[PDB]
Each structure stands twice: as C-alpha cells, then as structure tokens.
Design a protein that fits this description.
The complex is a heterodimer of chains A (214) and B (217).
Chain A (H helix, E strand, L loop, with lengths): L3 E4 L2 E4 L5 E7 L7 E6 L6 E5 L3 E2 L7 E5 L3 E6 L9 E6 L6 E2 L3 E5 L7 E5 L3 H4 L3 E11 L5 E6 L2 E3 L3 E5 L9 E10 H5 L3 E7 L7 E6 L4
Parallel strand pairs in A: 2-11
Antiparallel strand pairs in A: 1-3, 3-8, 4-5, 4-9, 5-6, 7-8, 9-10, 9-11, 12-13, 13-17, 14-15, 14-18, 16-17, 18-19
Chain B lengths: L2 E5 L3 E2 L5 E8 L7 E7 L6 E6 L5 E3 L7 E6 L4 E6 L9 E7 L10 E2 L3 E2 L1 E2 L8 E5 L11 E10 L5 E4 L9 E2 L3 E3 L2 E10 L7 E7 L4 E7 L2
Parallel strand pairs in B: 2-12
Antiparallel strand pairs in B: 1-3, 3-8, 4-5, 4-9, 5-6, 7-8, 9-10, 9-11, 13-14, 14-18, 15-19, 16-18, 17-18, 19-20
Classes of the chains: A mainly beta (214), B mainly beta (217).
The complex binds a molecule of 4 linked components (NAG-NAG-BMA-MAN) and chloride ion.
PDB class: immune system
Keywords: BIIG2 Fab, anti-integrin, glycosylated, immune system
Assembly: dimeric
C-alpha cells in the first residue's frame, strides 16, 4: 500500500491569512494526489485532484502542488467557511489510502466565558441522585480549566465534562461540567463552587451556591 | 446531483450481522465503483472494500474474511454485511464513489457516514431535568437556562428549544458516558424568562421517545 503521511495534525489561523498542509507518499505516485475538506453536517468534499487540478467549483484561493512523493495544499485569504478538516487521498493505485487529517482552527479575539452554575432539580433529587452543572459559554481560546469545590475542598471524583466544536456564528467554544453525587452526599455539604481559569482573567472566575438557600 | 446515503442500525449487539446500505442517486452503479470506508474511534480512514462497476468485489486483505459486499442495481443500493464486531466500538462507516477511464479518479462524492454502536446493552430513554438558576443566585437581564438529558443509550439524541422557535445561544454539548449510559446538557439564553416560557424538546429515536421539559423556578 502507499502510506500517506500528512502534517500537521493542527493549524490555527485568522480569516484572511494563509496556511499550507503537506502530504508525503511512501512511494512515488506521479501527480495522483487529491485533497478533501470535511465539515460537520457535510459529506467529505473533493477540492483538488491530480496534485494541482481544481474540481469545478473550488475557489481560486485553494491551490495544490507536487509530483512524486511530496504534495502541498495551500489555502490563501482564508474564509470562515474554510475552517474545518482537510485530508489527502492518493489515487494512483488501490487500495485507496489517506492522510490522517489536519484540523484548521479559526483564530479570533479572546472572549471570556459566561459562567453559570445550576443546583440539582427537585425532580432529580426525587430519584436519590444529584447533578450540579457548571457551564462556561462562548469563550476563546480553547484552553480552559475548571475546578469543583465542595465546602472549600476540591472534588475531582464524579466530575465529567465536554466541550463543543467551534461555534459556526462566533467561532467560540463552550464547556459543560457536571458533578454527580448521591442525594445523601449532596445534602451532607453546604457550599458548591465551580472555579474556572482562562487566559482572559488574571485570577479564576468563581460561581457558587449554598445548598442551605435552595 | 450525485448523492450517496448510508443507512443501517444505530445499535448492534456483539456478533449480530451488521448490514449497511449505501443508496445512490444521479449515477448508474454499472458506471462507477462504490467503496466502503470506516473511521474507527480516534483514527483515520480505513478502506474496507469496493463494489466494482462490473459486478466484482475486492476487500481489504486483513478484513476480507469478515466482510461481504454486494449490490442491487435496480434499487440503486450497495450493501456491506459484516460480522465479529467489537464490544463498545462506535465506528463510522462511509460509502464513496470513483471510476477509472483514462485514469483513476479519487473519490469524487462521499456519503455523510453513519455511526454504529456495538453493545449488548438495552436501549434506555433519558430522564430530562431543568437547568435553572436557584439557591440565591441573582438573575441578570439575560439568563442562561438548560436541560440535563441523563441516562440514555445509545446515541444519539436531539434537543430543540421552544419547538425550534428559540435559537439564541443554543449549545448542545457532547454527551459523556458513564456506567454504560450517556448524559448531555443543552443550554439557551433568554432575556424574557420567566414571564415567557422556555421548553426543551428532547428526542431519543432509539427508544422512540420525545419529551418536553419546561424550565421554570
Ligand atoms: C485494512 O484494514 C486494516 C484493519 O484490519 C487497517 O489497519 C489499521 O491500519 C491503521 C493504519 O496503519 C493502524 O493505525 C495505526 O496504529 C498504530 C499502532 O497503534 C498502537 O500502538 C502504538 C505503539 O504501541 C500506540 O502509540 C498507539 O496509540 C496504539 O496503541 C499507530 O502507531 C499509528 O499511528 C496508527 O494509528 C491500525 O491500528 C490498523 N488496525 C488494525 C486493527 O490492525 C488498514 O488501514 C486497512 N487498509 C487500508 C488500505 O485502509
Ligand atoms: Cl513520480
């Protein structure tokens, strides 16, 4: 098989800037390398083929070079719509083989998270369980860390979290963190705090509630 | 336009036959090859095999013994049947088209892929709980509300707000798995709550459930 090595795994750039992405075949394959774009909610889309030929409809800011082993996709003058994942496929021989992909992040201005904390619902406590939720919405950059504290002591047990992909309208991220515990555990403590560190604040953003006020 | 569409079960059990269908339109199966490709969890694309235009098949040599590809030209369908699945895997499977005339095209059109969950677990509908500020938290002019969609299996769900009418700062987060069940949150903002009602609509196709939860109080 022709092994395709793609680099890098990741890029970040601003709209209007230029990036390039490399693929390198393990054997010479003449000009027969194609580039594709992947974007949530869309089938993988053929951009370039035979190294440098644009598919009909591909904007002129995309270009490709190379013949032999070494290929490069260049994207100039980036549009928002161009942020997503790219991969290469050789089309010299079967089996089809593919690069491992490059995720291109849209670099926008810093944005501080809007932090919200939510006590368990009485509906859920009826079941004997409790979930405390902390949302950290519409922030940039991705880098973030969240601590839960219960009566001033860090709790990492029973915490799960996840982060959205970059927003289609404002290019931010959002994170949700859930502290799960028994009703008995929940009711054995008073102060619930989620503590959120992000480069937009010189010290942590803190949201807390006292269960005794619920 | 050219289209390829994968379909199959969202959940199989270990050792059940996994039957996938690729339904095509806007070209003839006797004129183009249709390939099957998978993307395991974590990973890049892996070629599984091809339904050649002329009716033969070829396979990834390491997977050959576990795959069967076929088609029904009258129905514009290509099939992939496989067996010996991997407990707890959530692979995505794709079909894609190519041809060879003077040269071999790359794959010019793809389907959007389907994800299959492999498990012996039961289908389980979510409980839906409100996310509302409480417990002495002063409510700003714009409030963040949400719904906690807890304890469902398998993926996916969908969440909408006020039946689609509300789409201000909607975020539906990736689900997390623990003790074999998924939990996700979905949030929206409102400047008019609680005078104006905010309701999440949660669908879980696998369990045939659709539940509304009005967020108040
Ligand atoms: C035909 O089907 C084959 C499956 O039967 C496909 O095989 C897969 O091929 C990919 C690409 O070569 C492999 O992915 C690589 O895995 C290695 C090994 O990773 C593990 O070990 C290292 C070191 O201990 C560790 O760093 C990793 O995290 C893993 O624990 C990685 O080093 C590579 O980066 C890459 O991910 C698959 O592992 C392999 N699967 C199996 C089940 O063998 C093959 O791609 C198909 N052929 C075609 C043409 O698509
Ligand atoms: Cl060459």
């Amino acid at each position: 098989d022709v092994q395709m090595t793609q680099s890098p795994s990741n890029l970040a750039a601003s709209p209007g800037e230029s990036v390039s992405i490399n693929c390198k075949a393990s054997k010479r394959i003449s000009k027969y390398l194609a580039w594709y774009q992947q974007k949530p909610g869309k089938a993988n889309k053929l951009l370039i083929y035979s190294g440098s030929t644009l598919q009909s409809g591909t904007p002129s800011r995309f270009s490709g070079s190379g013949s032999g082993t070494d290929f490069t996709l260049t994207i100039r003058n980036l549009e928002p719509e161009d942020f997503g994942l790219y991969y290469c496929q050789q089309h010299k021989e079967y089996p089809p083989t593919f690069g491992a992909g490059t995720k291109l992040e849209l670099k926008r201005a810093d944005a501080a998270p809007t932090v919200s904390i939510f006590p368990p619902s009485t509906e859920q406590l009826a079941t004997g369980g409790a979930s405390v939720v902390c949302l950290m919405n519409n922030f940039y950059p991705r880098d973030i860390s969240v601590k839960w504290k219960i009566d001033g002591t860090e709790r990492r047990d029973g915490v799960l979290d996840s982060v959205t992909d970059q927003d289609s309208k404002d290019s931010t991220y959002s994170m949700s963190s859930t502290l799960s515990l028994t009703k008995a555990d929940y009711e054995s403590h008073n102060l619930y705090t989620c503590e959120v560190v992000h480069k937009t604040s010189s010290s942590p953003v803190v949201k807390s509630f006292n269960r005794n006020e619920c | 336009q050219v289209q390829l569409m994968e379909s199959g079960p969202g959940l199989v059990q270990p050792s059940e036959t996994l039957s996938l269908t690729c339904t095509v339109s806007g070209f003839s199966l006797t004129s183009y090859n249709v390939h099957w490709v998978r993307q395991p969890p974590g990973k890049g694309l892996e070629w599984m095999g091809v339904m050649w235009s002329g009716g033969s098949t070829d396979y990834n040599s390491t997977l050959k013994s576990r795959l069967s590809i076929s088609r029904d030209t009258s129905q514009n369908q290509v099939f992939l049947k496989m067996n010996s699945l991997q407990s707890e895997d959530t692979t995505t499977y794709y079909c894609a088209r190519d041809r060879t005339m003077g040269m071999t095209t790359p794959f010019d059109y793809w389907g959007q892929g389907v994800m299959v969950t492999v498990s012996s677990a039961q289908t389980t509908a979510p409980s839906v709980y409100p996310l509302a500020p409480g417990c002495g938290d002063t409510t700003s002019s714009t409030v963040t509300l949400g719904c906690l969609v807890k304890g469902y299996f398998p993926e996916p769900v969908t969440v909408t707000w006020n039946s689609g009418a509300l789409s201000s700062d909607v975020h539906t987060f990736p689900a997390v798995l623990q003790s074999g069940l998924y939990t996700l949150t979905s949030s929206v903002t409102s400047s008019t709550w609680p005078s104006q009602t905010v309701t999440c609509n949660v669908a879980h196709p696998a369990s045939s459930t659709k539940v509304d939860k009005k967020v108040e109080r």
